[PDB]
Design a protein around this ligand. Structure first.
Ligand SMILES: O=c1cc[nH]c(=O)[nH]1
Ligand SMILES: O=c1cc[nH]c(=O)[nH]1
Ligand SMILES: O=c1cc[nH]c(=O)[nH]1
Lengths: 249, 245, 240, 249, 244, 242
């Protein structure tokens, strides 16, 4: 391999410069198969990669793992191999009551409740998505009959206390994060996820473009964790593939 | 008046929901006369306001003064009068060699080198402009034959040390800010101004829409003080008409 | 213009080394006319400047605008023209019950609830007024038969949330400022304003002298000319 | 499942109260096989879990993925299933010249160069391992003829800039981390890894025991990335299994 | 003197490489007298120092005063004199209800509620004790019939607001320390003392060994002020173990 | 006792509202004997306390130990017995080339390089002396024919690395403190000491008055001075209590 974790060489990407980067290694294939001549490339650790062709141009599909540290490796190592555009597709918990389960979120920027983003810029720097790629995501959403929620996402290094979940072993949240959900609600923050703060900060600062679209799987104003009663439309995966086509055409 | 500083009452605004907010009280009239039926509203301290109409729609034009603290008062008091959309038009120093004096920057989001932003959200919160309004600014640039630089802006509470100007009385920059310009350059930050970090944070947290377009009057890879020597204001008025259509 | 924002040259100051720096451009003329031979210098943006003469010596009167950022420009650019002493005058809202409307506050140092101070020193550095000029303000107070409240002022980048006002469109105060007025009250802080943290920190760290006097117009728990006559008296004291 | 990510129920753990938690899902099976009746439980995302028995006592082996956010989910979820003891096993880069490739480090505490620890305790709290489990890990190294390095570890949310690697696409490290390796070096910090600060802080604060043994795969005073010239003793996985047995006996 | 505050020369230490460092200058002599040939060395400011012998080997016993800043001077100056190992012995207030007055706490690491620690490393660095010396302390406890409580200690620059005492002139704690005791309790923190964050951070960063044992003189789940030692016997036993 | 560390009761102070607070226990008696009817009160740990009379008004002289933490205990326990004014006296190293050995400093406010100040107010609060006590100190200087340097002091929790000293075992200064003396020097800071941040902040926030005078005995850039600064502080006490 040309890179230390992903098991990939430059040749294996066949010139791809755009990556679709889901969180879950098990989603990779399905995303890939929405495009042409999808091919398995590698699987190492949380990093499963496929190659596919979007209207004839190579796209790499590579999972990140949960959270900013595994994301950071993925994004660096793909860029080492010539990727300069990273489209994240993900799942997310809504924190606003009007954002329904099954709705899609396009994140313009993120609250940096992570540590990896600080390793690319001080906290003063905005974890902001690339304008053209965000535009492409919005457009793919609307083309699909869906108006996305567009706004700010709370991007937390944890799933439990940092997203102010109480149904845990201790049922306690450290002071900084106690009441924090309300803080972000009040500020109009749409949702919680775990990677976009790192992805956006690292891409804005290193000269790469990123965007993120995500499907809402739970509304935190009603459940901490979704279950079988949770509402079971258009898919964030289809949208991202459509967005990638826009950007490569 | 029904607000504390601006000298305005709601009826004065004729239903305006959108403000164009330059820093310079003297730009207010000149923005306003690009529009129709320019009407003086009030002038107190650094806050001169005009009502004018953009293709039949009322728009307030209200200066902010230099910097976030005075901006925060104007944005708040306007919003108390029904303003929910704030378009900043400003001047700026570029810090990338590829950005020319005369060019326009549309700021997607801002590095928070201000303090007023912290009175609306802790630092982790992004100082991000509204997507729809930024889209409008970009379209207004392009409808005018201008390709804007669209990126991040360093928004500083000072013009001198925080923008790492050395041509001062003491010629020193405190440690945090020494080497800072290069830091932001390396990060692909386009430019320096003084208001957008506050403007964006307070609008994003308070449920209002903001965007900012600015004319590049100095390139900091060349010199500190801008040469005395429009495009930006015509773009903002163009964008206001897009948003109010 | 020798200087980019104020539209002043050094020659226009006639060697003035002391400035009175109110916040409001519209109050500069009237301050200036308390001294001799007041003359209009320039008006750009929020910066209106006058020259006048106190007991024969020139004194510049220049408005700062509201808040540290605009103040930091005025101060730096006046200093480039040879100013080395800056006397702030203004109004304020008190937060202690024993500080009545019609009193005078002399700020000895400020809680740094601003950003611009940090562009001159890290937060550990105290936002402290100059001893000599503070002393002159006190003395001018007492000459006018006013025993001033001498203490700490909370110097905020905002008028609204940073001063824990809830009479706003959203009625929300961010967490860090929720309960903050009471925090400052308990610590004996006298009042809120919006420029002294910046002014003080920048003058202390750059070698200039600063002090600040303000008339209490309102008390958050429950004169204008007085504050101006005192600052003019203080200027004379310092230039004598 | 009774936890949201791991796909596990409490019954699947056969009363296990201790987990060994490597980072790589592909290493779980292997570690499980140094114990008895190795039994696959689940595999979801980067989280592969096995049950095995260590001199008769049940032990869960579960991958964390890279970094503290993924680790934090596994640790919380295991603990909801009754685990109260977490033994990290992993690889590390040494930052002292006398810490050799092949050596093992038992971390007593970590420099918190992470975000996830702060969702458990403010930065003043020490990211300290449990004394008893640290002692057993030392004892298990010595039992095997290995004298471990015992000291402080730099625990970084990133592999690249936060570990002051410069062989990257931009070759730049943000101000805060430029020169940081020498700061940790000078302080006698032994090594870099990417999970222990989160693990330790989250366990110390929630009432669980944790410890970490790791093998040194590169010395950063000589190479950023190990390659085929790099040296390649008793394994860190052997030690951890040995520690587990001690602790459960 | 060879150093700026302690009034000590390197010769006076007779090759001692290990110090016992109590907080209280008046405990110094009592500790020294549990060893052989105890000899007053010096007394300046809060720094009272003795020499004594543990199974033939010299040990310096030198007080620190209360708090990190005076501790930082003493540890630095002793180390200038060849000391590489610093065993703190002290008093403390327990914040967990299962810890009794008269019990002993061995601090593995400390919450850095101090400022001097920052002068050796940024806050991210753990205020962690030396493994070997802690081991010695635990072992000394157990040989004495005392099971020590081993864990995390809140190491505070103040006795009053920083340990969230309210029985004070103003009866107020600044926001950051309001609720803080409950915070640390919830995180399993055992106790409050005033020196260990600084001692541990400075030793760990500068290549010296340190450990701390303390007698529990109050339980804060019951009251603020202690009612009017075995910790000293234990630390002397630990020094013996380390020197043997 | 009333108070746990100092071993004092209120009665013992004979109504004293003002303490002189030097660092060294050994120095208390001698400072007390510049006043009348010096009277031993107590001695525990590094806290030696004396009562004496300053032009017929009761004054406590109480040592603090080195540094903020031990000072915070003394000032709190004294305040619990009615003391509302605290005058710090001591020696210091100057960092400005214009401040000569034997000069006197009156600290108007301090750089907070200390942790205890944070246990009273967040860092944005200034570590400022009381104006009236500062004025008294300045007057006492001038009555003794001394013009004091009046400005900002860097108040450090360490003697060595926080004062950017490299004459240490390791010879190392952590990054934050690397180049820090030059930093303070450029800002006009006069000197380093180790207590005034703490004393100033706790006093300002708790409603008590404080000030600090120090005799310059070393200058980083280059007995009798000690005595001068002690005479000045006794003189200021007299002025304040008049
Ligand atoms: O609530 C949720 C759902 C998905 N991902 C998250 O980080 N949080
Ligand atoms: O350089 C410049 C020009 C205008 N405004 C700024 O903030 N900076
Ligand atoms: O409660 C107590 C007792 C002694 N030492 C402390 O720091 N706290």
């Amino acid at each position: 391999a040309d890179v230390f974790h992903l098991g990939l060489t430059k040749a294996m990407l066949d010139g791809a410069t755009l990556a679709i980067v889901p969180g879950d290694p098990e989603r990779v294939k399905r995303i890939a198969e929405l495009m042409d001549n999808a091919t398995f490339l590698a699987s190492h650790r949380e990093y499963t990669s496929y190659l596919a062709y979007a209207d004839g141009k190579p796209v790499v599909i590579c999972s990140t793992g949960i959270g900013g540290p595994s994301t950071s490796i993925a994004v660096e190592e793909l860029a080492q191999l010539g990727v300069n555009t990273f489209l994240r597709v993900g799942t997310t918990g809504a924190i606003q009551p009007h954002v329904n389960v099954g709705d899609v979120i396009v994140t313009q920027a993120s609250v940096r409740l992570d540590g990896a983003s600080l390793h690319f810029a001080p906290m003063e720097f905005p974890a902001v998505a690339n304008f053209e790629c965000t535009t492409a995501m919005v457009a793919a959403c609307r083309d699909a009959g869906v108006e996305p929620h567009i706004g700010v996402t709370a991007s937390s290094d944890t799933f439990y206390p940092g997203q102010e979940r109480y149904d845990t072993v201790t049922g306690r949240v450290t002071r900084r994060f106690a009441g924090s959900m309300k803080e972000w609600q009040d500020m109009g923050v749409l949702n919680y996820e775990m990677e976009s703060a790192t992805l956006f900060t690292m891409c804005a600062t290193q000269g790469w473009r990123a965007a993120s679209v995500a499907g809402v799987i739970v509304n935190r104003t009603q459940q901490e964790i979704p279950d079988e009663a949770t509402m079971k439309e258009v898919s964030a995966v289809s949208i991202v593939v459509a967005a990638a086509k826009k950007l490569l055409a």
